[PDB]
Amino acid sequence: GIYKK
Amino acid sequence: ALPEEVNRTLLQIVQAFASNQIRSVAEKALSEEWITENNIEYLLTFLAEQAAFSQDTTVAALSAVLFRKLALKAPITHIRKEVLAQIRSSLLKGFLSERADSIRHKLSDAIAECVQDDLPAWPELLQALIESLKSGNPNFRESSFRILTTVPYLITAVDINSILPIFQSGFTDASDNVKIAAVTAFVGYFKQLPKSEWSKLGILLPSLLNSLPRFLDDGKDDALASVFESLIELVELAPKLFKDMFDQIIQFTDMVIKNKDLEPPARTTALELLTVFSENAPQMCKSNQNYGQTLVMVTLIMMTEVSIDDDDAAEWIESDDTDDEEEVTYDHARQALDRVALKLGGEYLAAPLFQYLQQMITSTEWRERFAAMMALSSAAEGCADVLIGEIPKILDMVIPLINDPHPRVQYGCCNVLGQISTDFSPFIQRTAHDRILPALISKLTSECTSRVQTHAAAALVNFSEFASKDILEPYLDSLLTNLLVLLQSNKLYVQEQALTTIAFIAEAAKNKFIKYYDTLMPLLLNVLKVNSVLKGKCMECATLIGFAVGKEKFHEHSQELISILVALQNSDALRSYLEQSWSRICRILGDDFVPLLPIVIPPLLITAKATQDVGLIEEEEAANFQQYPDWDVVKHIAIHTSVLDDKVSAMELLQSYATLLRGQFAVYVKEVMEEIALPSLDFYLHDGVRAAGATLIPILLSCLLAANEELVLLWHKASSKLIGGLMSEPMPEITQVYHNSLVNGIKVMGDNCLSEDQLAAFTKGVSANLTDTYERMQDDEYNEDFTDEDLLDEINKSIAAVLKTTNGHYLKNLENIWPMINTFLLDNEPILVIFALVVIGDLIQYGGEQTASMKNAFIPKVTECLISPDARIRQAASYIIGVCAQYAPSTYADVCIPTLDTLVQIVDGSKLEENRSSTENASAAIAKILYAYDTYTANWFKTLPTITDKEAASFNYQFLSQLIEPIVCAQSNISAVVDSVIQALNERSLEGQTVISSVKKLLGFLDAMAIFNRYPADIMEKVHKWF
């Protein structure tokens, strides 16, 4: 999925 | 100063250090013969003389380093004063002589080891430092600042009117090195000294800040970045020091970051300085709207710095779905806006953010349309409090960009939709599924580039995670038909994503997925029977599907699937997928998994038995090991973190196996307990391992119990090591687990599971935890703790658990820590007060009326706590008053009924989610006083229903059951009587079958049915299974 770094 | 015999011996040894035969004959001689109480003085005198006077670069350097290492462990305190004086004067003479730069650095580090509280004054150095700072040689000035960095106490020793212009000269020195040294030494002062000393140098901050523009003039970007790195440390220490010149440093970093002819280090550090203010002084950032405006502006600028000299993004379209490591400023900007947003909230950041977002989405610069998307993605979580209500506008902005001509803007739009699907969940799933799903699904077509297809697919993972099966059902077929196409890509990362997306769609879809099993499972098997990650993800998808559809459907392909697992397992990222798939298969097959343990468990047992793997290393080889993420260091100690991370992973799996299989796992319990669980507590260099060992203990025991000398012995061993850890464990978070692990252990083992040796050692452990908790919390001009609330919450549990298993006997042992408890009760901070109140509440249950010795010691504080502004304190207090009249009726008569007035007041924003708990306990306490020993009973009745606190509801209703079986009986309160019961039942707070037939008796004396005409169909069906 989409995450933050 | 040394006998020529000694010199040549030691000179041979130190020269031998750089050459293995010649070499460690020497360091064995050094370690075993010369680092002794009889030779240390000679050895230190030698090395000091070598470093100071030898004209051989190597020997001088080595000796200076050796001296530094050896002066520490001697230690310099136990050295005869007359040799210390000799060593000092020679080091100093070497420092003031003609040496190489690196050697004077090592001389500096050596000299620093000769300065201490314990040690006789050394005014020659102080005088030497002052004259050296005035030298024309930069290395002399630099080395002096370096010494002040190691021993910042020296800054106190020098007259203030000399040290101040020294730093001001240092900040504006012609040499960059000296400047960096000056700044380092300045910040180091605050790093080491008490806050009471800070105001001595603090006044130098404006001088430092005014020196910064000079770096831009000289084009010294890297020196600037070094100075930024020091300032960042200073902001974490004393943010408020920056209050008066906050605007200029805000505008300076703005100026640096906008100058994009500069090399990235100057601009990333500048941004970090900005960022770090939000993390250390948020009130300050909020009180100045120029901050948020600047932070938003510059992060946006930096997020546009993608695909430089490549407007087609050709390099980006052709690469895989990983980050381009070269886009450093872009990445730094994303993390920065995220961190600040998380700290300041949307009320402050949303407005300036969207001012630019409005503008950038329309630009022809695709990079700005892209950047607008990523910025919203980073700020969404931290600005959620506000943006969660502006959700159709956001979609109105973002969704039209999903078909942007540039594929990197499309990607960006997929990013936002995915990101906000997480941060605004589950509300965005319930209210925007009709917009988000069609938009994402549309990007799955093979019309779009691989990168956009893949990212749309990723966003679907985010959405699914909090979308119910009912929301997904009409989209499932469309979703899957499209994803099957991604599955036929020639690009590997597209296939891998497709698998993962299907998996987690399946996980959310659950039984709604059963109709898709037949079309998918064969396509998966074909993939597996043919690229390690692909197979791993394919195995994950297969078992997640299996868990969704249930055991029966899964059984159509389970044995073949298992045979393929076996092939994969016994043939590094693949291993993780396999381990998880095994564990998921166990969840599915339940007890039918048991024959597969001999395959699954032994690999885990190995990884979980990993020893701490630590090599004690030298100070030079220190950073050297920490380049790699899998290694960390903290004498100096090199720990292999990933090996111990995998130790935790294996233990977590063993946990779940144990938890799922219960008694069927007993055969492993003894081994896992003695070889893995208990030794893990002694892993002092890894927190996770220690916690994993602790949580494992109760679950291991329950396994063996469910299936005895072994059980009793292991519990005795495990409880003792847990108890023994309470007095040694330095980490408060880990301490909490130990107490929690004891509670669960006690709950498993049952009655009287502790000997009174253990009860004693437990008390010493509790007292130590309380003592250390008190001191850590007993701690502004320069600056603006749930971890400890939580530790005290489980200490409440364990004491309560120990009281219960001893059936009261632990009252004796707890006597010895009441002074600690009493201190907490009166203390200012509510956290310490709440703890004490809960403890006293537990005490009276087993010690009523044993507690008359304590009565007037807490009741004065308890009665105050009743009216306290904190709901947590009122509740705990109300409970104590209640349990006073329940377990110790006559010892508290003179207190309970005078307070009966205050309870009637607190009982009436009371019936509201925040304090609904507090007022129900007071309601219970009133019912307890009324029972133990009459306008009050009618007042208590309209405090009903009791729906939150279960303990409180339990008493209130069989007080209601006994009040009848006056104001409650007959009359026309009969509809309020029934409903009071229905609400408690329906809310699952009420134990009530006592009251149900008390009610049924009343309904018999009548109109009986009409009382339930109020309730809807779902609650009526419950009523019929109730009455």
Side-chain angles (χ1 to χ4, degrees), chain A residues 1-2 4, chain B residues 1-20 22-530 532-571 573-618 620-634 636-708 710-732 734-784 787-860 862-904 906-910 912 915-964 966-970 972-999 1002-1012 1014-1024 1026-1027:
Chain A
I2 294 167
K4 294 186 296 182
Chain B
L2 282 184
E4 36 285 313
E5 31 201 54
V6 172
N7 282 340
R8 290 183 295 102
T9 302
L10 283 178
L11 185 49
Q12 183 279 317
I13 294 178
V14 59
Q15 286 184 219
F17 254 67
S19 168
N20 298 2
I22 285 317
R23 151 157 192 169
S24 158
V25 160
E27 36 202 4
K28 149 176 305 189
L30 189 57
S31 167
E32 298 179 352
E33 298 200 77
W34 287 100
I35 303 183
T36 68
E37 294 136 307
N38 285 246
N39 296 307
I40 181 59
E41 286 190 13
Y42 281 68
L43 177 55
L44 288 180
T45 297
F46 172 82
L47 296 171
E49 282 187 333
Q50 292 304 304
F53 305 117
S54 173
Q55 245 218 323
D56 178 26
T57 311
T58 318
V59 161
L62 203 279
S63 299
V65 175
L66 264 186
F67 180 94
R68 187 188 85 249
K69 297 184 189 305
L70 271 37
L72 280 160
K73 24 179 287 186
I76 199 74
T77 309
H78 307 131
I79 270 68
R80 92 169 266 204
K81 76 186 287 192
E82 305 75 19
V83 166
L84 179 61
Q86 184 65 59
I87 290 164
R88 276 177 168 176
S89 46
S90 55
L91 276 182
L92 199 54
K93 188 163 153 129
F95 179 96
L96 297 162
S97 61
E98 247 304 311
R99 307 309 268 159
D101 292 338
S102 67
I103 292 183
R104 182 168 286 110
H105 285 171
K106 285 154 181 171
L107 276 175
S108 298
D109 298 332
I111 286 173
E113 300 310 314
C114 296
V115 176
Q116 235 149 345
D117 285 340
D118 318 308
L119 268 52
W122 188 11
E124 286 93 345
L125 167 66
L126 300 179
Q127 218 64 260
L129 278 179
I130 293 174
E131 246 315 320
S132 298
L133 289 157
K134 297 182 176 182
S135 151
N137 184 7
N139 185 255
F140 265 92
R141 307 196 298 276
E142 194 207 8
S143 290
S144 304
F145 279 123
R146 182 192 181 93
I147 294 179
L148 299 177
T149 308
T150 307
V151 207
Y153 156 59
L154 295 190
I155 303 175
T156 304
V158 182
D159 181 63
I160 186 66
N161 271 311
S162 307
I163 197 62
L164 292 184
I166 275 163
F167 274 107
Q168 299 185 314
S169 184
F171 299 155
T172 60
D173 193 272
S175 161
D176 298 327
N177 289 339
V178 179
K179 291 197 289 194
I180 298 178
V183 180
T184 299
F186 174 79
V187 178
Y189 176 86
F190 299 86
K191 264 161 110 177
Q192 224 80 41
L193 276 83
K195 291 183 176 191
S196 54
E197 293 303 285
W198 290 9
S199 67
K200 219 160 297 188
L201 283 208
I203 63 176
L204 282 186
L205 182 54
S207 300
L208 175 44
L209 296 184
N210 285 329
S211 73
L212 298 181
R214 188 63 190 281
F215 287 102
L216 293 177
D217 296 339
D218 291 316
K220 254 64 181 170
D221 323 312
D222 178 88
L224 179 58
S226 300
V227 174
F228 274 149
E229 267 160 5
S230 288
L231 282 179
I232 294 157
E233 301 178 60
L234 188 62
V235 177
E236 285 156 12
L237 279 154
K240 279 203 170 186
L241 212 51
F242 294 81
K243 194 219 337 179
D244 295 318
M245 302 185 69
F246 197 23
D247 276 339
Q248 188 215 314
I249 190 61
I250 288 176
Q251 250 326 102
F252 187 73
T253 62
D254 179 88
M255 186 170 69
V256 171
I257 296 164
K258 283 177 157 111
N259 190 345
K260 54 172 58 193
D261 280 336
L262 298 182
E263 224 70 30
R267 309 172 63 226
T268 53
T269 46
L271 170 58
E272 177 71 10
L273 184 55
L274 254 191
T275 304
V276 149
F277 279 110
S278 75
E279 284 168 342
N280 293 278
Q283 302 182 12
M284 190 174 70
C285 299
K286 288 174 172 173
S287 81
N288 180 22
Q289 99 177 336
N290 201 37
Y291 174 81
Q293 187 62 59
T294 297
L295 188 279
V296 163
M297 190 186 195
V298 298
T299 57
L300 278 170
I301 284 186
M302 295 172 81
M303 282 189 221
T304 77
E305 305 184 13
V306 285
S307 295
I308 68 176
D309 301 334
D310 183 20
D311 296 79
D312 291 330
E315 183 182 359
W316 177 90
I317 297 177
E318 183 64 16
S319 62
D320 60 3
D321 66 337
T322 61
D323 289 347
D324 195 335
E325 63 184 344
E326 292 178 354
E327 288 171 344
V328 177
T329 53
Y330 163 79
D331 173 40
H332 270 255
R334 265 209 85 193
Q335 288 180 36
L337 181 60
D338 175 35
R339 286 164 62 191
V340 174
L342 290 169
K343 288 307 178 183
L344 303 187
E347 255 303 310
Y348 179 80
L349 267 196
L353 173 63
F354 268 88
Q355 269 166 10
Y356 284 92
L357 289 186
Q358 176 187 25
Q359 210 156 286
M360 300 180 71
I361 52 184
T362 68
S363 157
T364 60
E365 296 176 351
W366 66 260
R367 281 158 181 107
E368 279 209 5
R369 297 195 302 276
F370 163 82
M373 296 295 95
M374 297 321 262
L376 179 49
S377 302
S378 305
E381 174 181 358
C383 304
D385 50 343
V386 164
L387 293 197
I388 209 165
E390 253 330 301
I391 188 156
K393 165 203 213 201
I394 292 168
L395 296 181
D396 290 340
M397 303 183 174
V398 160
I399 290 178
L401 288 193
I402 207 161
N403 287 287
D404 186 272
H406 202 281
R408 192 152 178 173
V409 181
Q410 288 178 16
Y411 175 97
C413 176
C414 288
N415 196 90
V416 194
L417 293 177
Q419 190 56 58
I420 68 181
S421 292
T422 288
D423 305 326
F424 299 163
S425 63
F427 313 102
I428 191 165
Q429 278 83 359
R430 289 167 193 154
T431 64
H433 64 71
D434 55 309
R435 300 184 67 185
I436 298 184
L437 293 173
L440 291 178
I441 288 164
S442 69
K443 301 324 288 172
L444 296 177
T445 76
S446 34
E447 276 328 339
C448 311
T449 173
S450 301
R451 290 301 302 270
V452 170
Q453 294 187 278
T454 310
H455 211 53
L460 283 173
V461 177
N462 288 81
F463 188 90
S464 293
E465 188 181 352
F466 297 101
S468 74
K469 54 185 175 173
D470 293 332
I471 280 167
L472 290 180
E473 191 194 308
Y475 300 93
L476 285 182
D477 191 54
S478 179
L479 286 159
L480 293 183
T481 64
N482 277 285
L483 288 162
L484 298 182
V485 176
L486 274 71
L487 200 37
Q488 311 176 248
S489 170
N490 42 335
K491 251 157 180 180
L492 188 65
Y493 70 85
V494 175
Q495 273 154 26
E496 291 176 1
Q497 180 61 57
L499 291 178
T500 302
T501 297
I502 291 162
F504 287 108
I505 283 171
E507 178 180 67
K510 302 177 192 299
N511 65 290
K512 300 291 178 168
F513 205 85
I514 303 188
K515 71 151 82 174
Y516 302 101
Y517 179 100
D518 283 332
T519 75
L520 253 161
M521 201 52 62
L523 273 44
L524 294 181
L525 291 174
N526 287 353
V527 160
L528 292 168
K529 294 196 251 177
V530 154
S532 321
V533 179
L534 190 65
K535 290 195 175 190
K537 287 187 156 65
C538 191
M539 183 60 68
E540 174 178 67
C541 173
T543 49
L544 275 167
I545 286 176
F547 187 76
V549 299
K551 182 180 190 173
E552 295 307 310
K553 189 56 165 172
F554 179 65
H555 203 88
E556 292 176 17
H557 288 98
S558 70
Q559 243 208 354
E560 172 169 13
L561 212 48
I562 288 170
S563 85
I564 289 170
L565 260 184
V566 174
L568 294 179
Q569 167 162 314
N570 299 278
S571 65
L574 179 54
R575 150 184 149 190
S576 178
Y577 288 111
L578 300 188
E579 286 176 352
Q580 286 294 320
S581 286
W582 279 117
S583 178
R584 200 148 30 223
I585 287 187
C586 182
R587 291 175 172 278
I588 304 169
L589 301 183
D591 280 334
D592 287 339
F593 187 81
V594 167
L596 288 169
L597 292 173
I599 298 169
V600 149
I601 303 303
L604 291 183
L605 292 178
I606 301 305
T607 304
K609 280 166 184 169
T611 56
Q612 211 163 25
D613 182 15
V614 160
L616 322 186
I617 60 171
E618 295 84 356
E620 308 93 45
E621 282 197 348
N624 193 317
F625 261 25
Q626 242 164 355
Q627 335 170 298
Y628 323 138
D630 297 351
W631 282 94
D632 278 49
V633 303
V634 289
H636 295 167
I637 289 177
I639 74 155
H640 192 9
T641 308
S642 68
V643 147
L644 290 179
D645 279 345
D646 293 344
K647 181 183 179 78
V648 176
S649 296
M651 295 164 73
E652 281 171 355
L653 281 169
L654 289 179
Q655 271 230 81
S656 54
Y657 281 121
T659 296
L660 296 173
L661 303 175
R662 290 134 315 176
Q664 298 298 324
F665 196 77
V667 66
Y668 295 98
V669 168
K670 170 169 164 47
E671 177 175 2
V672 185
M673 182 68 79
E674 287 176 353
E675 293 197 51
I676 304 175
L678 299 181
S680 288
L681 300 186
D682 300 340
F683 277 56
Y684 58 99
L685 296 166
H686 198 282
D687 60 313
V689 169
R690 273 179 267 124
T695 66
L696 201 33
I697 292 175
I699 294 178
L700 290 189
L701 296 170
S702 69
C703 286
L704 199 53
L705 175 68
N708 183 17
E710 294 284 359
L711 177 55
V712 154
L713 191 97
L714 285 170
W715 168 233
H716 173 87
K717 232 174 287 184
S719 56
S720 286
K721 195 149 193 178
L722 277 175
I723 283 171
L726 300 177
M727 213 143 68
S728 61
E729 181 57 48
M731 297 261 290
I734 305 301
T735 308
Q736 173 182 359
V737 180
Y738 288 3
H739 277 277
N740 175 249
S741 184
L742 273 172
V743 177
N744 298 322
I746 291 174
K747 189 166 208 59
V748 163
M749 296 304 303
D751 268 320
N752 229 24
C753 54
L754 299 162
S755 63
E756 240 153 353
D757 290 303
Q758 297 176 309
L759 297 175
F762 170 69
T763 307
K764 323 191 114 167
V766 171
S767 184
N769 295 156
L770 291 176
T771 287
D772 289 345
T773 300
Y774 174 79
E775 305 182 305
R776 292 180 295 101
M777 206 155 313
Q778 269 322 278
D779 314 344
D780 178 78
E781 186 180 350
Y782 304 100
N783 299 94
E784 292 188 355
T787 41
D788 277 304
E789 195 197 68
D790 293 347
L791 173 56
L792 295 171
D793 283 347
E794 222 81 7
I795 289 190
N796 280 319
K797 307 288 187 65
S798 60
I799 290 176
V802 167
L803 272 160
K804 179 172 173 177
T805 188
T806 57
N807 222 326
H809 281 281
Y810 185 65
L811 287 162
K812 144 44 182 180
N813 300 88
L814 195 144
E815 293 174 350
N816 319 344
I817 63 168
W818 182 273
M820 279 302 303
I821 293 171
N822 194 236
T823 310
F824 276 50
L825 175 57
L826 326 163
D827 188 296
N828 288 338
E829 234 143 62
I831 294 176
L832 306 184
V833 184
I834 293 163
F835 171 79
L837 287 179
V838 172
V839 171
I840 301 176
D842 291 338
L843 280 161
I844 306 173
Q845 163 175 3
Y846 308 90
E849 335 202 336
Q850 292 61 11
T851 44
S853 322
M854 309 164 179
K855 171 181 173 178
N856 258 345
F858 58 81
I859 285 187
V862 165
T863 48
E864 292 180 351
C865 288
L866 283 171
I867 223 68
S868 168
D870 198 332
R872 315 178 285 179
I873 307 187
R874 300 194 295 268
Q875 153 167 313
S878 315
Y879 185 68
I880 289 189
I881 290 302
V883 308
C884 275
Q886 208 193 331
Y887 297 98
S890 48
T891 291
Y892 292 92
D894 58 328
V895 179
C896 283
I897 320 151
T899 58
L900 188 52
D901 295 302
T902 51
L903 300 181
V904 161
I906 302 162
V907 88
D908 274 26
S910 69
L912 174 152
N915 325 134
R916 185 183 297 276
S917 192
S918 289
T919 68
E920 277 179 0
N921 287 277
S923 170
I926 281 185
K928 292 174 176 179
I929 297 170
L930 291 164
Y931 174 76
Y933 320 142
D934 173 82
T935 318
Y936 305 78
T937 87
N939 229 26
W940 160 87
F941 183 79
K942 227 47 201 59
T943 81
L944 303 196
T946 308
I947 57 186
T948 292
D949 195 281
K950 305 170 186 183
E951 245 276 327
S954 183
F955 192 98
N956 272 349
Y957 282 94
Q958 40 194 17
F959 180 41
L960 179 65
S961 184
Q962 293 172 328
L963 263 166
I964 322 153
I967 180 57
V968 162
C969 189
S972 52
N973 288 336
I974 203 175
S975 183
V977 166
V978 170
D979 187 71
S980 78
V981 177
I982 298 298
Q983 293 309 316
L985 293 175
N986 190 80
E987 249 315 306
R988 277 171 316 272
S989 63
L990 192 73
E991 44 286 39
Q993 310 64 35
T994 300
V995 204
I996 279 187
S997 281
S998 307
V999 169
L1002 272 165
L1003 296 175
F1005 292 173
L1006 278 167
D1007 295 297
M1009 317 168 164
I1011 297 193
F1012 304 92
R1014 346 175 62 237
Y1015 304 108
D1018 71 281
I1019 301 193
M1020 276 303 287
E1021 186 184 351
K1022 294 177 181 177
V1023 167
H1024 287 234
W1026 285 338
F1027 298 93

